[PDB]
């Protein structure tokens, strides 16, 4: 067919690179994280939308793999709270396993270029996002800490609350948006290069958020809210301040938000969806966030990762153009992580402070004084 | 002086490399790790042996910064061994900030390569240790997170007991030296290339850990048993066994070590004990280790940072060799992490199955029932 030959050629061309996926938790569900040995299973999955032989023939360029890790749901909340930063160090540890155990599919990226140089080599350029600020266990410097491990997206909540931002899912509403703590978190997260995600939060906490970042953000994986009223996809009031904001909405393929009954979801609702967005908003502001592996069965048409293809063709067979099907496939979130980096680079060469933990006092004012009279009497010698 | 032109050049030749540091908790304990506008204070310290200014004074090429936290005082076992693991990020990120900050200084490094490459720009090699698997909260997916955050040696104990091995200070013994798990983990150290450490851990989890060791070994800082018997120092059955291991002790400068009367301790005890080693172990077998910031006073001649050209010209005065010199001022700790590397990437490349962390089951069989009947409906598809 030469309108999927078509597809294949662009998907050879540029990176269709997708805004979320599940398959770190599917790996700590079904192997508990002990991938030793288990290369036919990690190939030909007995559970889930996404495994490495699928990963192939749809023909990804590029995923966000989730570091998702459930809400704390032990009563002492500073122990929930430490638990899954724990529980993320895990998620980030199976997928820098997974990527390193198979370097002739998986090359991790950071960046724009490390993506380029992922792709030019036939690679799928695995990044990494985790979902919630419950995760960082209340800590810039965890936060700091994982990005240095390479994440570059911060989903601000997943459908729990936290000390940052409001959740959408939950009611009633803890901050009404963001927390001052939140504001201030936005301006740490611009300074250090992290790419904010507004998936999962509140209708007024994304209004916020895009009227006071200095970086364009992304929705990871969320849908549009005038096509299906749900309070996980995006209002047009929020769409036009994410056109503002040069940000990109990652459109999902979760049936709950594509269809009223969640069995007639189709790749044609998904199609729908993406043309809605860049009709009103532009096609450069546009993306694929599946959230492959958040659900036990995709849409008619996009069940699993090898249907890729197919999303590519359908978008072309209803007309949109090649260069825009490209900027949607991955140019527009390369462009917006190239961006988040363009700032962080130019707020950390103007010397703009970082944001600190709140910490305990260690010393007394007795250790102190024994301190300053030894440092005292070296200085005398 | 002749003998201090020597001492001058040397430190010019080759980089001294301090096995054992603490200004990251002095930094902790007099700033709360808030660095912003304190660049005055960081090179001219109101208090402790370690400011930025002191350290180019003392002409050190490298140095070990410990990202000690310490051991957890919580009766809630679980909440201080979680805690413990959130202050090590704390101290990760300011140890990772202060290098960023003062890049004209000093220059982080992980390898023997990164080591020359700063000493070669005229900066300290800036290398990391933890003091303690207390810190790690029982997951070796943690340990991986804080090598690839660059810590490079692991402290076994401090002066606490672990799941993994037994501390000096702490009586009655735990385990009796390593336990099953400890053993285990030996391997998975060397199989990441993450350099043991057995300072602070007790005589015989010393003896056992320098048979089952694939890779050299450190003594970050500790000092010798025969000329003060401490429980902190090394015996001469475990010196042959660091020889036999190809490993380093790296000499401290703590008083309570060196001289049965703390105030008595001076730079010549440390020299002594340096030529004790060397004499019977060979030269690159020994290497620097102060703890400065591990102490309120250090020893008459050695105060703080600045005192390291008198040491180097305190080994050549009681003729100790040029080339010998060289090898205990940082060519032998050099080697080590050289060795360790070599080690891991000999194992790695060998295929050799990493050391996975015990986890819940998150899925019950019914869920599990699922995603099977979810994956097959796929398949017939
Ligand atoms: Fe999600
Ligand atoms: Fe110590």
């Given at each position: 067919?030469?309108?999927?030959?078509?597809?294949?050629?662009?998907?050879?061309?540029?990176?269709?690179?997708?805004?979320?996926?599940?398959?770190?938790?599917?790996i700590?569900?079904?192997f508990?994280n002990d991938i030793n040995g288990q290369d036919?299973?990690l190939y030909?999955?007995?559970?889930?939308?996404?495994?490495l032989?699928?990963?192939?023939?749809?023909?990804?360029?590029?995923?966000?793999?989730?570091?998702?890790?459930?809400?704390?749901?032990?009563?002492?909340?500073?122990?929930?709270?430490?638990?899954?930063?724990?529980?993320?160090?895990?998620?980030?540890d199976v997928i820098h396993r997974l990527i390193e155990r198979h370097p002739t599919i998986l090359?991790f990226?950071?960046?724009?270029?490390?993506?380029?140089?992922?792709?030019?080599?036939?690679?799928?350029?695995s990044?990494?996002?985790?979902?919630?600020?419950?995760?960082?266990?209340?800590?810039?410097?965890?936060?700091?800490?994982?990005?240095?491990?390479?994440?570059?997206?911060?989903?601000?909540?997943?459908?729990?609350?936290?000390?940052?931002?409001?959740?959408?899912?939950?009611?009633?509403?803890?901050?009404?948006?963001?927390?001052?703590?939140?504001?201030?978190?936005?301006?740490?997260?611009?300074?250090?290069?992290?790419?904010?995600?507004?998936?999962?939060?509140?209708?007024?906490?994304?209004?916020?958020?895009?009227?006071?970042?200095?970086?364009?953000?992304?929705?990871?994986?969320?849908?549009?809210?005038?096509?299906?009223?749900?309070?996980?996809?995006?209002?047009?009031?929020?769409?036009?301040?994410?056109?503002?904001?040069?940000?990109?909405?990652?459109?999902?393929?979760?049936?709950?938000?594509?269809?009223?009954?969640?069995?007639?979801?189709?790749?044609?609702?998904?199609?729908?969806?993406?043309?809605?967005?860049?009709?009103?908003?532009?096609?450069?502001?546009?993306?694929?966030?599946?959230?492959?592996?958040?659900?036990?069965?995709?849409?008619?048409?996009?069940?699993?990762?090898?249907?890729?293809?197919?999303?590519?063709?359908?978008?072309?067979?209803?007309?949109?153009?090649?260069?825009?099907?490209?900027?949607?496939?991955?140019?527009?979130?390369?462009?917006?992580?190239?961006?988040?980096?363009?700032?962080?680079?130019?707020?950390?060469?103007?010397?703009?402070?970082?944001?600190?933990?709140?910490?305990?006092?260690?010393?007394?004012?007795?250790?102190?004084?024994?301190?300053?009279?030894?440092?005292?009497?070296?200085?005398?010698?």
């Amino acid at each position: 067919s030469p309108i999927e030959e078509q597809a294949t050629r662009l998907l050879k061309e540029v990176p269709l690179i997708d805004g979320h996926n599940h398959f770190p938790y599917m790996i700590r569900g079904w192997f508990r994280n002990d991938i030793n040995g288990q290369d036919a299973h990690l190939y030909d999955m007995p559970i889930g939308q996404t495994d490495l032989q699928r990963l192939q023939k749809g023909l990804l360029g590029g995923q966000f793999w989730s570091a998702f890790v459930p809400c704390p749901k032990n009563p002492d909340k500073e122990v929930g709270s430490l638990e899954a930063l724990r529980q993320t160090l895990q998620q980030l540890d199976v997928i820098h396993r997974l990527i390193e155990r198979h370097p002739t599919i998986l090359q991790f990226a950071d960046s724009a270029a490390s993506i380029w140089s992922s792709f030019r080599a036939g690679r799928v350029a695995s990044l990494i996002g985790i979902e919630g600020l419950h995760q960082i266990a209340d800590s810039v410097s965890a936060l700091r800490m994982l990005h240095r491990l390479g994440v570059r997206y911060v989903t601000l909540t997943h459908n729990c609350h936290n000390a940052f931002a409001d959740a959408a899912t939950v009611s009633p509403e803890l901050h009404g948006g963001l927390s001052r703590k939140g504001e201030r978190l936005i301006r740490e997260l611009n300074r250090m290069g992290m790419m904010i995600d507004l998936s999962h939060t509140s209708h007024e906490a994304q209004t916020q958020a895009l009227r006071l970042s200095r970086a364009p953000v992304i929705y990871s994986h969320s849908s549009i809210y005038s096509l299906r009223a749900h309070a996980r996809n995006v209002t047009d009031e929020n769409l036009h301040l994410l056109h503002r904001n040069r940000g990109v909405v990652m459109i999902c393929f979760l049936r709950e938000l594509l269809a009223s009954e969640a069995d007639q979801a189709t790749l044609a609702h998904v199609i729908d969806h993406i043309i809605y967005a860049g009709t009103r908003i532009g096609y450069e502001h546009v993306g694929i966030g599946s959230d492959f592996d958040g659900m036990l069965r995709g849409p008619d048409g996009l069940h699993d990762v090898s249907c890729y293809p197919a999303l590519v063709a359908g978008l072309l067979e209803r007309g949109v153009s090649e260069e825009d099907v490209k900027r949607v496939m991955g140019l527009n979130v390369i462009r917006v992580l190239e961006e988040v980096e363009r700032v962080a680079a130019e707020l950390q060469g103007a010397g703009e402070e970082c944001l600190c933990d709140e910490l305990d006092e260690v010393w007394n004012e007795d250790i102190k004084e024994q301190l300053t009279r030894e440092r005292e009497r070296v200085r005398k010698l």
